[PDB]
UniProtKB/Swiss-Prot annotation:
Post-translational modifications reported in the UniProt record: Autophosphorylated in response to blue light irradiation. 2 molecules of FMN bind covalently to cysteines after exposure to blue light and are reversed in the dark.
Organism: Chlamydomonas reinhardtii
Location of the protein in the cell: Membrane
List of residues that carry S-4a-FMN cysteine: C41
PAC domain mapped to chain residues: 65-109
Tissue expression as described in the entry: Expressed in gametes, pre-gametes and gametes generated by pre-gametes (at protein level).
Function in brief: Protein kinase that acts as a blue light photoreceptor. Required for non-photochemical quenching (NPQ), a mechanism that converts and dissipates the harmful excess absorbed light energy into heat and protect the photosynthetic apparatus from photo-oxidative damage. Controls the energy-dependent chlorophyll fluorescence quenching (qE) activity of chlorophyll excited states by inducing the expression of the qE effector protein LHCSR3 in high light intensities.
Name of this chain's protein: Phototropin
Domain (PAS): residue spans on this chain: 1-64
Chain residues that bind FMN: N40, C41, R42, F43, L44, Q45, R58, N73, N83, Q104
Length: 109
């Protein structure tokens, strides 16, 4: 298929830290698990990231909704890339959101 990466955020912690990342996520961003696990994904953002799109994800996460946005993101070396990002909430049977899962696609083409 098309090249994509996958992460899991723990929504039981208040700031959705990342608890699992696929090998391509590390390879695409230049960050190691030592710098990725335990942190909110937003460290990938930088000067040119559109706050109106960031705002859309902040809201959907607060509301436990799925969401899809394209964001400017930066590698560890500072270089930018366009990240089409889809977040999906994973609920327990009591309707509570337990995890968020992300699919990130570098769509710089
Ligand atoms: C990031 N991927 C990503 C994956 C998941 C599963 C979740 C829940 C969030 C992200 N983010 C965004 C970040 O964690 C946060 O949700 C937003 O920045 C909005 O909240 P704030 O408080 O910061 O306004 C991802 N952000 C990225 O920039 N790149 C991703 O790959």
């Amino acid at each position: 298929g098309l090249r994509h990466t996958f992460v899991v955020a723990d929504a039981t912690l208040p700031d959705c830290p990342l608890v699992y990342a696929s090998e391509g996520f590390y390879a695409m961003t230049g960050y190691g698990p030592d710098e990725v696990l335990g942190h909110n994904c937003r460290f990938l953002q930088g000067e040119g990231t559109d706050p109106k799109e960031v705002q859309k994800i902040r809201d959907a996460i607060k509301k436990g909704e799925a969401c899809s946005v394209r964001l400017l993101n930066y590698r560890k070396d500072g270089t930018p890339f366009w990240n089409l990002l889809t977040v999906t909430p994973i609920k327990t049977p009591d309707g509570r959101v337990s995890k968020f899962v992300g699919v990130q696609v570098d769509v710089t083409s």
